[PDB]
Design a protein around this ligand. Structure first.
Ligand SMILES: CC(C)(COP(=O)(O)OP(=O)(O)OC[C@H]1O[C@@H](n2cnc3c(N)ncnc32)[C@H](O)[C@@H]1OP(=O)(O)O)[C@@H](O)C(=O)NCCC(=O)NCCS
Ligand SMILES: CC(C)(COP(=O)(O)OP(=O)(O)OC[C@H]1O[C@@H](n2cnc3c(N)ncnc32)[C@H](O)[C@@H]1OP(=O)(O)O)[C@@H](O)C(=O)NCCC(=O)NCCS
Ligand SMILES: NC[C@H]1O[C@H](O[C@H]2[C@H](O)[C@@H](O[C@H]3O[C@H](CO)[C@@H](O)[C@H](N)[C@H]3O)[C@H](N)C[C@@H]2N)[C@H](N)C[C@@H]1O
Ligand SMILES: NC[C@H]1O[C@H](O[C@H]2[C@H](O)[C@@H](O[C@H]3O[C@H](CO)[C@@H](O)[C@H](N)[C@H]3O)[C@H](N)C[C@@H]2N)[C@H](N)C[C@@H]1O
Ligand SMILES: Nc1ncnc2c1ncn2[C@@H]1O[C@H](COP(=O)(O)OP(=O)(O)O)[C@@H](OP(=O)(O)O)[C@H]1O
Lengths: 176, 181
């Protein structure tokens, strides 16, 4: 299988719904209205089999502040492979597409991973963040300790001290 | 299907081949008569470029990049318009309208609102298409906290997509290097 990249604005309404339902079912309900909102706005890597969406990952644009610079970041959201199609390395095909988008448009990729998926990201060259994570909330920088240990980055055109602070920009729901 | 002549084509930054990317950058930089910095170029990257081609050259460009604008404590998902330019030999023919057809389509299909900071020259063009001028004070959520951006007051326009915005309220953009708006 090979993923196809489609911008959110190019999704017909039937396709957009098929994605939301497949991703929601793949997370077994652990995917909220704001998790879905966070998957919108960027490029969706999609894998189909006979007219049905069997795999999805989205890369959206945001800023991550590292050593005072607001790095242009491709943030990965909604990675999911339909349950009956798992164990077939379809996720590797989704990540090939999302990583291609990073190399062509961003300074680094980033994402917040489940304890499970960590081996997968690390095997592809993603780096686990060791420094304290924070978010630039409307009141100012606030640490995000519940997200520590879950963030991974994919440097594109920068070497990174992964034990320095990393502060994402603000949004509703999970900020990472 | 007709030839598609002068219809703007949408291409993500990651899909621009090297020659096209350089053509866009020199064209947009030259369209602005020296008021387009390296940082302003960086701001045009990461999203969808609306491109109009003529004889293999880019004669108009507008990019829609994604960011958040904070309104009443809500981080709205915004398509922000950067690098709007029509090459000078092609101006006066409404090609910017063709760019905006594409930009507005991206807003309706992917964001809660479009926004941009307009030149005094271009304000009427946007207002004519239904973009609303932002009358409230503007600010940016800088690393030290909110800070007003008075130099950007009276320049911002928005295109709400099925959300109602009180355009007299404070509007606070997220942080980046260079001009935040
Ligand atoms: C995480 C996920 C995207 C991986 O997709 P995938 O294509 O199945 O991944 P792979 O084929 O490379 O397999 C990954 C691991 O999943 C497990 N797995 C294998 N078969 C499985 C099956 N039939 N059903 C469920 N999990 C299975 C194994 O641990 C496997 O390790 P291995 O490849 O070294 O043997 C997928 O399990 C899924 O969508 N999970 C729920 C959503 C979620 O957690 N997404 C990740 C968010 S960061
Ligand atoms: C703003 C811009 C994109 C408009 O593009 P366009 O396709 O030429 O727009 P229009 O055809 O609607 O012309 C806009 C106005 O420019 C003027 N104009 C006409 N011919 C012109 C020319 N040859 N050169 C300069 N301005 C001209 C007229 O005032 C016209 O208004 P009208 O339609 O009411 O007569 C273009 O002038 C530009 O690239 N300027 C430099 C970059 C810039 O400032 N971008 C704006 C980003 S906010
Ligand atoms: N809930 C659905 C989401 O799950 C993941 O991210 C989320 C991570 O899974 C979250 O991680 C949390 O849940 C995981 C997985 O159960 C735990 O391993 C982890 N220690 C805990 O902090 C982290 N705290 C936030 C992040 N948005 C996907 N990357 C995106 C998806 O929207
Ligand atoms: N300099 C190149 C840029 O010009 C425009 O935006 C810029 C606006 O033109 C700027 O507006 C300023 O410049 C214009 C003159 O062009 C004045 O009308 C306005 N009062 C003044 O504040 C505003 N302050 C910042 C914004 N990024 C383009 N939309 C984007 C482009 O990168
Ligand atoms: N209305 C326009 N304003 C500005 N340039 C224009 C316009 N109409 C035609 N041109 C250009 O003026 C040149 C001559 O136009 P044509 O290509 O139509 O010429 P031709 O029919 O005689 O072969 C072309 O530019 P190029 O040679 O650098 O590619 C063409 O793009």
């Amino acid at each position: 299988h090979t993923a196809r990249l489609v911008h959110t604005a190019d999704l017909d309404s039937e396709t957009r719904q098929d994605i939301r339902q497949m991703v929601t079912g793949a997370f077994a309900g652990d995917f909220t209205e704001t998790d879905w909102e966070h998957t919108l706005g960027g490029m969706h890597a999609l894998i189909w089999h006979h007219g049905a969406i069997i795999a999805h990952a989205a890369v959206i644009q945001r800023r991550l502040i590292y050593r005072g610079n607001a790095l242009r970041c491709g943030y990965v959201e909604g990675v999911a492979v339909r349950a009956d199609w798992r164990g077939q390395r379809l996720v590797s095909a989704l990540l090939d597409a999302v990583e291609q988008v990073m190399r062509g448009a961003y300074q680094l990729g980033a994402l917040s991973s489940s304890a499970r998926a960590r081996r997968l990201y690390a095997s592809r060259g993603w780096l686990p963040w060791h420094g304290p994570t924070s978010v630039l909330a409307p009141t100012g920088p606030v640490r995000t300790p519940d997200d520590d240990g879950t963030v991974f980055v994919l440097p594109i055109d920068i070497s990174l001290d992964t034990s320095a602070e990393l502060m994402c920009d603000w949004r509703a729901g999970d900020v990472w």
